[PDB]
Design a protein around this ligand. Structure first.
Ligand SMILES: *[C@@H]1O[C@H](CO[C@@H]2O[C@@H](C)[C@@H](O)[C@@H](O)[C@@H]2O)[C@@H](O[C@@H]2O[C@H](CO)[C@@H](O)[C@H](O)[C@H]2NC(C)=O)[C@H](O)[C@H]1NC(C)=O
Lengths: 48, 96, 96
C-alpha cells in the first residue's frame, strides 16, 4: 500500500457566470424608427 | 482595504480589471450621443434603435459587500452561520 | 433616372425653407424625407457623394444642396423610460 507522508494546501479558482445583461426592446423603435406610417402599419400587422 | 477607496478586496480589483466590460455605467445622455457622432459608438447606435440595457438591481459595491460579509462570517464564525445563528470560533480551531 | 443615392440637379417644384439645427424636424433633402435632428458634421464627402449611410443602412449624413455643408442626422426619440405604480386599484398616482 502507498501512504502519503506529506501534503500541500492548494488554492484553485472556479469561475462561474451568475447573470447576463438585462435588455429590453422598444419594438416600435426598432421596426419603424420615427415613422408614423410604419407605426400604423405595425399596429395593423398585429402586436407580437 | 480600510484605507483604499475601492471598498473591495485586492483580488476582486484584479478580477474586475481582467474583464473588459465595454461601456462603463448604464446612462448615455442624448447630448452625449449627439456631440460624439464622429465616433460611431456602438452603444449610441443600439440605443437609437430601441435596444436598451437595464442596470442590475444590486450594484457592484453591494455585491462586494455581500462577498465581504460572507468572507468575514467564514473567518469569524465559520460554517455555523449557514444553519442557525453565527457562532464565533477561533480560526485555528475551525481549521482543526 | 436615379432617385435618392447621388447628387441631383433636376428637382420638383417645391419651396425650400431655412435650415434648422439642433431641433427635431421633419426634413426633406433633395426628395429624401424623414424626421430627425440636424447638426454640423465633420465628415468629408467627395464631390460625387450626396448621402452617407451607417452600418444599418440608415441615412445618417447629407450634404446641404445650397451651402454644401455636411450635416449629421440623428433620431428624435432616445432614452429608456419606466413607470412605477402601486396598483391602479390602490391609486392612480405613478412615478416615472
Ligand atoms: C444658393 O443661393 C443661396 C442664396 O443666395 C442668393 O441670394 C438669395 C437671396 C436668393 O436669391 C438665392 O436664390 C441666391 O442663390 C446661397 O446661400 C448663401 O449662403 C448663406 C447661408 O444660408 C445664405 O444665407 C446667403 O444668402 C448666401 N450667401 C451669399 C449669397 O453670399 C447659396 O450659397 C447658393 N448655393 C449655390 C450652390 O449656389
Amino acid at each position: 500500500i502507498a501512504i502519503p507522508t506529506n501534503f500541500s494546501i492548494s488554492i484553485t479558482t472556479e469561475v462561474m457566470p451568475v447573470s447576463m445583461a438585462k435588455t429590453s426592446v422598444d419594438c416600435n423603435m426598432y421596426i419603424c424608427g420615427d415613422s408614423t406610417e410604419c407605426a400604423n402599419l405595425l399596429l395593423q400587422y398585429g402586436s407580437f | 482595504d480600510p484605507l483604499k477607496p475601492t471598498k473591495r478586496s485586492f483580488i476582486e480589483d484584479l478580477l474586475f480589471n481582467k474583464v473588459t466590460l465595454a461601456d462603463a455605467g448604464f446612462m448615455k445622455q442624448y447630448g452625449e450621443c449627439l456631440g460624439d457622432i464622429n465616433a460611431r459608438d456602438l452603444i449610441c447606435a443600439q440605443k437609437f434603435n430601441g435596444l436598451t440595457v437595464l442596470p442590475p438591481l444590486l450594484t457592484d459595491d453591494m455585491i462586494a459587500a455581500y462577498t465581504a460579509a460572507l468572507v468575514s462570517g467564514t473567518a469569524t464564525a465559520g460554517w455555523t452561520f449557514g444553519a442557525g445563528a453565527a457562532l464565533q470560533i477561533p480560526f485555528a480551531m475551525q481549521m482543526a | 433616372f436615379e432617385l435618392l443615392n447621388a447628387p441631383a440637379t433636376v428637382c420638383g417644384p417645391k419651396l425650400s425653407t431655412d435650415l434648422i439645427k439642433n431641433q427635431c424636424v421633419n426634413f426633406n433633402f433633395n426628395g429624401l424625407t424623414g424626421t430627425g435632428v440636424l447638426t454640423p458634421s465633420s465628415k468629408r464627402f467627395q464631390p460625387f457623394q450626396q448621402f452617407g449611410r451607417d452600418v444599418s443602412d440608415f441615412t445618417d449624413s447629407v450634404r446641404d444642396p445650397k451651402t454644401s455643408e455636411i450635416l449629421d442626422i440623428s433620431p428624435c426619440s432616445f432614452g429608456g423610460v419606466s413607470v412605477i405604480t402601486p396598483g391602479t386599484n390602490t391609486s392612480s398616482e405613478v412615478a416615472v
